[PDB]
Amino acid sequence: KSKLPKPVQDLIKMIFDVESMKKAMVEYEIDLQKMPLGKLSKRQIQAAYSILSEVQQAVSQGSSDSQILDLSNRFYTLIPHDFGMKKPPLLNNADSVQAKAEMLDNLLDIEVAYSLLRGGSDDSSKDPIDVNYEKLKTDIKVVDRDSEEAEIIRKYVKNTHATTHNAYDLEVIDIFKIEREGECQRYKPFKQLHNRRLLWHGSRTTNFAGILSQGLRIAPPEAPVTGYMFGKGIYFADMVSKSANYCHTSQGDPIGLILLGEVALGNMYELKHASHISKLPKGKHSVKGLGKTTPDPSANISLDGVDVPLGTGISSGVNDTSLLYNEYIVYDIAQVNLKYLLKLKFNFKT
């Protein structure tokens, strides 16, 4: 039997749940009979991203819907979708490209999680929770509820739930302190950079075995850059609810996971509208998407020499922006040092 704390054991059970991986694929309208979990490969995902990039070019160059039908069918050939003896919807627009790139980004994390379960050793004398914990190459510790670090984290959650995300409220169940093997060493060129901030990143529970083993990653070269608002980077928010929306929890599955990462932002390239960039302008280290609302800067605090923007939301004074809240993007995986993982209960009012 495992000696791991019960909250860590429950976390491991959650992120390696095979039935949850299947459900995520069903949600993504994938045909499980034609493409089951075991059949998912990096090669097929990579080939589907390329078709998506082909669709991105045909949509921008104003190709006919007749010409687009063949690229759309090509996509469904690589990634079977659930329809039956039916005709699938046309991938003939930017919204379609964006939704399919988002789906493939999720399939990459699910493939990692499933490859970790199949690629190891089999020993019935060891607790399978202990076996799976070791596959993550991450030290996971429970943060004491009464500590100052837990108080700062709970205040950050409490103060940054946006009014426009009023459909649910959040309850912090567990706070974990996480240390991914070799991540601190990788972060070393950025450890003293200015503007280091503790920011949120939400994701589906089915992505966390991939996030903990491989860290936060950028979409591959084959992925269509126009499929992402600020291009292929790693996205963060300073508002908990903006990130919690990415958990995709529901009344039937209300437990979600969200990260707190130290992000070395440096000189930020400030943007108000979409810019599908391939690289940053010289001297810039990140992108800050300017929101209409920002946490109150007078309420900024320090937790281990890093800024924590835990103030309640106030007007940023920024006009004519496509964003309600800020977002931060980095384009080098080394600019992120994952610090905490929170298990949250969503209480829906709807």
Ligand X SMILES: CCc1cc2ccc(CN3CCN(c4ncc(C)n4C)CC3)cc2[nH]c1=O
**Residues involved in catalysis:** 327
Is 143:11 a contact under the CB 8 Å cutoff?
no
Shortest gap between Cβ of 67 and ligand X (angstroms)?
29
What DSSP string runs through 315-338? E----S-SEEE-EEEESSGGGEEE
Which residue's Cβ lies closest to ligand X? 243
Q: How many of the chain's residues bind ligand X (CB under 6 A)? A: 18
- Tell whether residue 114 is a contact of ligand X (CB under 6 A): no
Nearest-approach distance from CB 235 to ligand X, in angstroms: 4
End-to-end CA distance of the chain: 41
Pick one of 25, 28, 72, 202: the residue that binds ligand X (CB under 6 A). Answer: 202
Residues 6+ apart with CB under 8 A from 212: 15, 136, 137, 138, 178, 180, 341
**Strand order in 286-289's β-sheet?**
234-236, 327-330, 286-289, 268-271
User: Does 46 engage in binding with ligand X (CB under 6 A)?
Assistant: no
SS3 107: helix
108 belongs to the binding site for ligand X (CB under 6 A)? yes
SS3 at position 68: helix
Q: What are 310's two structure tokens? A: 């835990």
For residue 200, state whether it binds ligand X (rule: CB under 6 A). Answer: yes
Is 237 among the residues that bind ligand X (CB under 6 A)? yes
Pick the closer one to ligand X by CB: 12 or 110. 110
* Residues from 65 through 94 that contact ligand X (CB under 6 A): none
To the question of whether residue 231 is assigned a binding role by annotation, the answer is no
Which CB atom, from 59 or from 219, has the smaller least distance to ligand X? 219
| Helix, strand, coil distribution of the chain in percent, nearest 5 | 40, 25, 35
Determine which residue in the list 9, 72, 96, 106 makes contact with ligand X, applying CB under 6 A: 106
Q: How far is the CB of 275 from ligand X (least distance, A)?
A: 15
Report the chain's C-alpha Rg in angstroms.
21
Q: Which is nearer to ligand X, 75 or 235 (CB)?
A: 235
Could you say which DSSP state residue 259 is in? E
Q: Assess 28 for contact with ligand X (CB under 6 A).
A: no
**Is 243 labeled as ligand-binding?**
yes
Cβ atoms of residues 110 and 35 within 8 Å: no
**Dist CA 170 CA 244 (whole Å):** 9
Q: Which of 92, 206, 207, 293 binds ligand X (CB under 6 A)?
A: 207
Q: According to the binding rule CB under 6 A, does residue 339 interact with ligand X? A: no
Backbone angles phi, psi at 12, to 5 degrees: -60, -50
Stretch that binds ligand X, among 4-12, 59-67, 90-98, 195-203 (CB under 6 A): 195-203
What does the alpha-carbon distance between residue 45 and residue 309 come to, in Å, rounded to a whole number?
Answer: 37
Contacting ligand X (CB under 6 A), which of 53, 92, 132, 203? 203
**Binding to ligand X in span 239-268, by CB under 6 A:** 242-243, 246
The count of C-alpha atoms lying within 13 angstroms of the C-alpha of 152, restricted to the half-sphere facing its C-beta, is: 18
Tokens 């990415």 locate to 246
Stretch that binds ligand X, among 29-37, 92-100, 129-137, 196-204 (CB under 6 A): 196-204
Half-sphere exposure of 74 (CA within 13 A, CB side): 15
Residue with tokens 């009012």: 349
User: Is 222 among the residues that bind ligand X (CB under 6 A)?
Assistant: no
Question: Which of 201, 285, 292, 343 touches ligand X by CB under 6 A?
Answer: 201
> Which amino acids are annotated as binding site, given as ranges?
201-203, 210, 217, 243
Residues near ligand X (CB under 6 A) are 105-106, 108-109, 200-203, 207, 217, 219, 235-237, 242-243, 246, 327
